[PDB]
From Swiss-Prot:
Tissue specificity annotation: Expressed in brain, heart, kidney, liver, pancreas, placenta and skeletal muscle.
UniProt name for this protein: DNA cross-link repair 1A protein
Subunit architecture: Binds constitutively to TP53BP1. Binds CDC27, which is itself a component of the anaphase promoting complex (APC). Binds PIAS1.
Family of this protein: Belongs to the DNA repair metallo-beta-lactamase (DRMBL) family.
Role summary: May be required for DNA interstrand cross-link repair. Also required for checkpoint mediated cell cycle arrest in early prophase in response to mitotic spindle poisons. Possesses beta-lactamase activity, catalyzing the hydrolysis of penicillin G and nitrocefin. Exhibits no activity towards other beta-lactam antibiotic classes including cephalosporins (cefotaxime) and carbapenems (imipenem).
Compartments it resides in: Nucleus
Protein source organism: Homo sapiens
Induction (free text): During mitosis. The mRNA encoding this protein contains an internal ribosome entry site (IRES) in its 5'-UTR. This 5'-UTR generally suppresses translation while specifically promoting expression during mitosis, when cap-dependent translation may be impaired.
Amino acid sequence: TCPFYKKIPGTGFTVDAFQYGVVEGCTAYFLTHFHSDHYAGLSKHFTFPVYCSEITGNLLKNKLHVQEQYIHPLPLDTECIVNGVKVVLLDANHCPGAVMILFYLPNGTVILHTGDFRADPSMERSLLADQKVHMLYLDTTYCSPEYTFPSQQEVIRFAINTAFEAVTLNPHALVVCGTYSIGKEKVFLAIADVLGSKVGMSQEKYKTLQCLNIPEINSLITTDMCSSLVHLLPMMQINFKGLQSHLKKCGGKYNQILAFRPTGWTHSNKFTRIADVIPQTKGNISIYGIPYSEHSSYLEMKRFVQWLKPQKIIPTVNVGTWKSRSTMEKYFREWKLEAGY
Ligand code: NI
């Protein structure tokens, strides 16, 4: 049944709660972003109002065939009224179209649901700075101090320099980038840009990217694989078997693959610097795992919460075990005592 942490008290609202059937007493279903653990259950047969960003509403219509009359897209950074309650959508710094939601309850409580986010200091100068937040529904994916990772910028720098070196040394090398959802587009687009190529992909993935309002997108992507030296493939195919296979398909146009797997965190983060990342190589195939995260590091999350000073925190990730729950609650108390709220 619908967990409490998907329900917004004092409203008839739910957040990312599409897999429970009809939630009893829910008059509006918010969707923070287009990732499957969050949209699970939406289809053309859904007949309740869904509130979301423009981008997320393009994906609902075009990819899941939700009928237009049930999609209620909202502009960002704008006070809007939904079933008599003031709300604001803010950028979540996650994937394209991902939002955080501010709810201004009739009784005077203010609630921020982060959806999935990567906390950033730029958030300290949105509409959040203007008033106090009593309850925080927090993306806790990496709420433990072992989770450090580089900035997105340092990671993209590493990838651009690696790819550019490899292809200038060998103009017959192919670059492959793995994907399984939206998000992380900068990886493959930045690499294609430095190489003077478009990114070649399947028709289903090209359709997905055309929903996202990226500027100049017709200039960076294509479904003609033959004319491209940066190919996007399902993350499942980013392994030695899958890449040998794919290489055979290119018909002797290429004699080497350099592949990128942008993971979340992986334990080499505890030791290794970005400068010091190396591939796994077999034959004429190399695979780089790069730590491109679209969730907060532990330290980014701590800063955000210590700035915001909420009165109550409700975790939305890693809530299924007692040892996780208990550990998270201990960090929340540490942060509150160190900062004095
Ligand atoms: Ni997500």
